[PDB]
Amino acid sequence: ARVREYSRAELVIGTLCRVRVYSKRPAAEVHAALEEVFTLLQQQEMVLSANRDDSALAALNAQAGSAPVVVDRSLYALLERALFFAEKSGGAFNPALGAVVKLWNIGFDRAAVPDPDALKEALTRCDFRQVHLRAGVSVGAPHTVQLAQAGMQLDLGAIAKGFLADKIVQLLTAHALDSALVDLGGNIFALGLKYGAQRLEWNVGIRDPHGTGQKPALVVSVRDCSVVTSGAYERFFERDGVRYHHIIDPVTGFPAHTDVDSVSIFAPRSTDADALATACFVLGYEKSCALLREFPGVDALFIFPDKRVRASAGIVDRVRVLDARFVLER
Ligand SMILES: Nc1ncnc2c1ncn2[C@@H]1O[C@H](COP(=O)(O)O)[C@@H](O)[C@H]1O
Ligand SMILES: [Mg+2]
Ligand SMILES: [Mn+2]
């Protein structure tokens, strides 16, 4: 029985999604698993997307200020985890920021900054504490979500890829697979060990924040771990010499002014790594270190504008610098 390596990639959830698997199972079993991975990603785009009119999320947003809406258990659990990270991060990560994001968004398409007052009004509609999750305790009791504040809008952009990466890992595992690299628009989950039959940790790349993306600046060897990076240059537009990126500081309503160029979070669950990466980017380095003390099972790697790199204890020894312009502090 021989080891074989498979990959498959498709444009879905608005980005390139790729899954690579090593397996000794019959090829047909791997093919079935990958078929289901990409079916899932198609189905979940229609549940979670904040920028399609026809998604379950859009439907829920349409009911802001009205009666509770029934949701499936999966979406409920994701919202629960998002609100947990909102609270722990003091709202640096905020899953109800749609009123503001949507105002900037159109800025992106047609390169214009929002309007002062319009922006201030939108900020009044982003209180994630007004998202009420209820689930009864009896058999088959429904799960519901109520957006209490009129005009408030969920946007799960900062946690949905993490959630989907976790869902994919669970799916692979259900198909008796135990070696894969899941890559959803750069949101990585390294499942198990790869093959060289020599077994090796996955070598996960981290990009130069100002690079053309082609080559990684650094690589970190990991097993059974998500690696998710948030950065100031993954998405932005420029107007009159100022750059405006996609990660909003909920206090200002503007793209976060922060002291790091990127933050990469290493965690057993990609949902958690994704939420934390965004929170940390917003909070900046010192406040991130403080927040991260709450989550002992997580590691983090910060790339600074001066190309210094700092990594926490659990991963620093597994980091290798590939672009010598960067320096790993020890
Ligand atoms: N502070 C924030 N908290 C949560 N979601 C955000 C925030 N700022 C922007 N977003 C949304 O989440 C995306 C960024 O997620 P990420 O790339 O995971 O940091 C943005 O493109 C927005 O859709
Ligand atoms: Mg995120
Ligand atoms: Mn992300």
Curated annotation (Swiss-Prot):
It comes from Treponema pallidum (strain Nichols). The keyword Amino-acid biosynthesis does not apply. It is a lipid-anchor. Belongs to the ApbE family. The gene is apbE. It holds the Pfam family ApbE. The lineage of its organism: Bacteria, Pseudomonadati, Spirochaetota, Spirochaetia, Spirochaetales. Monomer. FAD binds at A92, F93, N94, D155, K161, H246, I247, I248. This is FAD:protein FMN transferase. Keywords: Cell inner membrane, Cell membrane, FAD, Flavoprotein, Lipoprotein, Magnesium, Membrane, Metal-binding, Palmitate, Signal, Transferase. It catalyses: L-threonyl-[protein] + FAD = FMN-L-threonyl-[protein] + AMP + H(+).
